[PDB]
Amino acid sequence: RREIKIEGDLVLGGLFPINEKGTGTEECGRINEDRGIQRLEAMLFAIDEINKDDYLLPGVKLGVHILDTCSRDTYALEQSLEFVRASLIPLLIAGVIGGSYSSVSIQVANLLRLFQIPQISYASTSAKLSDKSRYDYFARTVPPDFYQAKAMAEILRFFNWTYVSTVASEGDYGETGIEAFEQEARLRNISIATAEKVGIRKSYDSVIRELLQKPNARVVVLFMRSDDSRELIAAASRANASFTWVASDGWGAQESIIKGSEHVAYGAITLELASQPVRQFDRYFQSLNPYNNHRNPWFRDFWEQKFQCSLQNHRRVCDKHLAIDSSNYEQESKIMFVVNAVYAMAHALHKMQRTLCPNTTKLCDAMKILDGKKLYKDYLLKINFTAPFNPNKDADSIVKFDTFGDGMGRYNVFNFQSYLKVGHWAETLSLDVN
Amino acid sequence: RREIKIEGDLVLGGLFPINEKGTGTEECGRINEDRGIQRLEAMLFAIDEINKDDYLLPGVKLGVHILDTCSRDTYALEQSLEFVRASLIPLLIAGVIGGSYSSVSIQVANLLRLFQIPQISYASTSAKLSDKSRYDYFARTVPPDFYQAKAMAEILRFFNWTYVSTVASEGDYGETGIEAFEQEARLRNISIATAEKVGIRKSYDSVIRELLQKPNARVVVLFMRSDDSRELIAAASRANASFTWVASDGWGAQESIIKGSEHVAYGAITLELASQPVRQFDRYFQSLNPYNNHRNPWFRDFWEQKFQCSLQNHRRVCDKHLAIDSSNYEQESKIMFVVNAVYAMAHALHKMQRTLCPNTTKLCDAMKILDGKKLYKDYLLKINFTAPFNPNKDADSIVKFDTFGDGMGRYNVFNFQSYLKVGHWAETLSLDVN
Ligand SMILES: N[C@@]1(C(=O)O)C[C@@H](Sc2nc[nH]n2)[C@H]2[C@H](C(=O)O)[C@H]21
Ligand SMILES: N[C@@]1(C(=O)O)C[C@@H](Sc2nc[nH]n2)[C@H]2[C@H](C(=O)O)[C@H]21
Ligand SMILES: [Cl-]
Ligand SMILES: [Cl-]
Ligand SMILES: [Cl-]
Ligand SMILES: [Cl-]
Ligand SMILES: [Mg+2]
Ligand SMILES: [Mg+2]
């Protein structure tokens, strides 16, 4: 199999959806450029930055064992066995960075707790992962999706919107989120007219009718995914219904949802995961090409797929001058979370080495037989640090986890006109005038 | 490491506490003769009997991969990695037989569900293992300890004992059992005077006083372990209190508990796991000696430890004529459960091969890429068969599992005089005149 194995005094395992879930027969499909290639390179970028940082793990070199998940649960577990074979050629696995999808992260967390291997995910937002009776070694730099509920209800409780109607998607997201919203609304005196769930355009048209049948609530709180949100706005367009929507990140600040139904959408309050681009990362990512990137065994497949050419005769040959640049690259939204996950692990290990190895920077016999239980509970859960590549080194650039290992809730608010950043929800709400 | 690896068309993995949990530093201590050696040999005995049985898996040879757990959770998981490395030299692991202790079985179940490997335990009685949201691939031939509660309360509800007092041990056993009793008593109108829990002889003496403080209940339902039960009867002896005890298998029909306090114990109704000895097994077990048993790599250690001699110079040499016989061997209480667990797996696989391989006895390509999900839910959970070595082939010799994979509740009742078998509790109660 394909992998990135780089020796180090301590090794962080990594799991990324380098490939899309394979079609019917096959395990893996094409290369996931954004969630796969970029997120993987952001790990390598952070490891490289930590290994040049004399104030972080000055005498401990970080190594990596990066593996593809193929955006599948089973494939990720088979791969994860490398991290656990080690725990017993396999390396000194101090922790695991990943995965992306929550189904992957859940299955990996299930294997990892058995061997006391700390795990930080940069993208898995399911609420299930907050259950420490099941995922006791899991932590994440991204907040759980249920925090959007707390935030959305605060946007209502500010604007005193007490009589509100709700629509929710089917599955883990909609159901766990809306249930969290209901409970947070009940806590803040807010009432529900109709709780419509959604598993044909006529089905969404039926939901709009039930939303009209209670004309008392103008405010409709939405906790749906992208495709669901887009077809319920077109369903509100067909019936020409005028509702002020307060939607989750499934809608967010994207054009996909509002395409051809802009009129019915005006003045909708949406949520989006606040993230700041890692500038130094853009420079590193764009500098990569098949001539300089031999350490990534997927980079040639990535390149060949991106530029639709062959590096190697009925295929068109790749131009030696092709480049990842401003015309074809835009930093993936979760890069900041990948970098912060890697550094949280580095910060935890650095405080551990500092404590367990008095009068040395080097990995002493105590750290050599790593107590994962101690690393997670005593170091990882107790670290707070300014994000490494955040320009404004303020209180909202602090990387910390609550008692459940969940990252800090940081969402932005977006008004519709044209999406406009009308505020944020950190621990508390913030809005302007729109 | 030490192991029993025997090739077969299908392989059953096995886990047994061959060694006692090691002292402080060490992982493994001495050889557990009864729960380790015997239970392991009962697996090998059943595999041998199935491989001679032309009506059970006629054209599929069962192989084994038997490993030591060292009566530890971590050691069992490290070993279990052999079963999962296979699932991907490692063999075709169709299922796992074990472990003994519930902490071992819980940790193994946690690894095994990930790889869809069915698991049958012959001894793990914890209630936690009935939770299919956690242990979805686990089943057991032994019933969960909480069934004793249902049975004990029926002994009260027969004799109309409605005003009853309770004492419970600390930990998984006492607490889960007594809570199950309370709920089953509340269902049957029975009331509780004092619910005394127990984590010094004076501490048990305090409990007896609280039991006296409510002189209304003569009946005291006990859900404690052996050591706890023995010190609460001596505590009732010191204070000279006369209570009719209705106790769980922690007390059962053993002399250990009643030693020096026989008077206070008279007329106590105790529970014990009903099991019938496997006669053909006694013949096989006693026939074993270091000359004929090379397949068990622990048998020389077992022998050397049992007879306190060396097979190999300051140690006394083993007499070539020493033998496991009536003077030193008594079939371990759970042997029947080991044999039944192995056969339930064989019966499940046989019905699977029969269905998935029309017009052949041999392992066809469908069975070669085994669906553990199907084997467990569709075959293992749906098998019912007369116990292989049970003389009276009646309805109480049926090996079956409920929807949670739990084996059939079969306990015996024991009156004190001298312990006397005064009845049984199968699905319903049965008693005589005593
Ligand atoms: N938030 C995610 C999570 O699984 O927690 C969900 C998926 S996105 C998706 N695709 C279909 N439904 N949802 C992935 C996102 C990311 O990789 O940024 C994580
Ligand atoms: N019933 C058991 C289970 O763990 O389910 C409990 C232990 S016995 C024990 N020793 C200390 N406390 N309890 C073991 C018994 C067996 O091997 O027959 C299984
Ligand atoms: Cl993933
Ligand atoms: Cl979902
Ligand atoms: Cl065990
Ligand atoms: Cl216990
Ligand atoms: Mg450094
Ligand atoms: Mg046969």
CSV table of C-alpha atoms in Angstrom, one decimal, chain B residues 288-292 303 307 309-311 316-324:
chain,number,residue,atom,x,y,z
B,288,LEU,CA,-3.2,-36.1,28.8
B,289,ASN,CA,0.5,-36.2,29.8
B,290,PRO,CA,3.8,-34.6,28.7
B,291,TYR,CA,4.5,-37.5,26.4
B,292,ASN,CA,1.2,-37.2,24.4
B,303,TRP,CA,2.3,-30.3,34.7
B,307,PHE,CA,2.9,-31.9,40.5
B,309,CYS,CA,8.5,-31.2,40.0
B,310,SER,CA,10.8,-30.8,36.9
B,311,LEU,CA,10.4,-32.7,33.6
B,316,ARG,CA,12.8,-32.8,42.2
B,317,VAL,CA,12.2,-34.7,39.0
B,318,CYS,CA,8.7,-35.7,37.8
B,319,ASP,CA,7.8,-39.4,38.1
B,320,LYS,CA,7.2,-40.8,34.6
B,321,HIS,CA,4.0,-42.4,36.2
B,322,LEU,CA,2.3,-39.2,37.6
B,323,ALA,CA,-1.2,-38.8,36.1
B,324,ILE,CA,-4.2,-36.4,36.0
